[PDB]
Design a binder for this molecule. Structure first.
Ligand SMILES: O=c1[nH]c(CS[C@H]2CC[C@H](O)CC2)nc2cc(NC3CCCC3)cc(F)c12
Length: 186
């Protein structure tokens, strides 16, 4: 269960999100930005953030990233977040989880934010608990262990490039909160 508030171009949140989107997608046309309010998903996410904060020390565990999807997946995502059934439909090259882009222009590709019948594209601005990350590979359904001494001490997410990331993979729904849906067109 969830609700969705459309933000007005005059609200600080709209402008914050638009600004970040527009850093690589200015030449596209924003039609609306919606804030997604899903209590259970948000409660689960904040619980995961508390334990991750008390584990990774000084690490800034949270990044805001982009996720392009088809119109048909918006209801499933607003309702159950980036759950396993959704990840099944994501790429594999860096593991079997949900894929998130540092730059909007990556997520805006038609391959990901597929234009619907009316030419409308959908990209989420997502809160993701990236935590401590390592290089991903095709065989992962969860991040590797850091050490063999402790095989239950896992990296929090994986990436294409640890020092210069372009994307991150999350393997659990409670690691990614879809705060904002950007609806836009070419
Ligand atoms: O924004 C993205 N969204 C997505 C979801 S795809 C979408 C297609 C329609 C289905 O119903 C729902 C899933 N995947 C990504 C992957 C990326 N990279 C991988 C690709 C090739 C190896 C790495 C970079 C991305 F930005 C993104």
């Amino acid at each position: 269960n969830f609700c969705v508030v459309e933000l007005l171009p005059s609200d600080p949140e709209y402008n914050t999100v638009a600004s970040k989107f527009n850093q690589t997608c200015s030449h596209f046309r924003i039609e609306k930005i919606e804030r997604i309010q899903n209590p259970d998903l948000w409660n689960s996410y904040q619980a995961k953030k508390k334990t991750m904060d008390a584990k990774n020390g000084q690490t800034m565990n949270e990044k805001q990233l982009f996720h392009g999807t088809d119109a048909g997946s918006v209801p499933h995502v607003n309702r159950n977040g980036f759950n396993r059934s959704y990840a099944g439909k994501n790429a594999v090259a860096y593991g079997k989880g949900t894929y998130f882009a540092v730059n909007a222009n990556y997520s805006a590709n038609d391959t990901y934010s597929r234009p619907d019948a009316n030419g409308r594209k959908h990209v989420y601005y997502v809160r993701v608990l990236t935590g401590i990350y390592t290089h991903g590979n095709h065989s992962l359904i969860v991040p590797p262990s850091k050490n063999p001494q402790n095989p239950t001490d896992l990296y929090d997410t994986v990436t294409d490039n640890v020092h210069h990331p372009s994307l991150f993979v999350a393997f659990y729904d409670y690691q990614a909160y879809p705060e904002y849906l950007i609806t836009f067109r070419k």
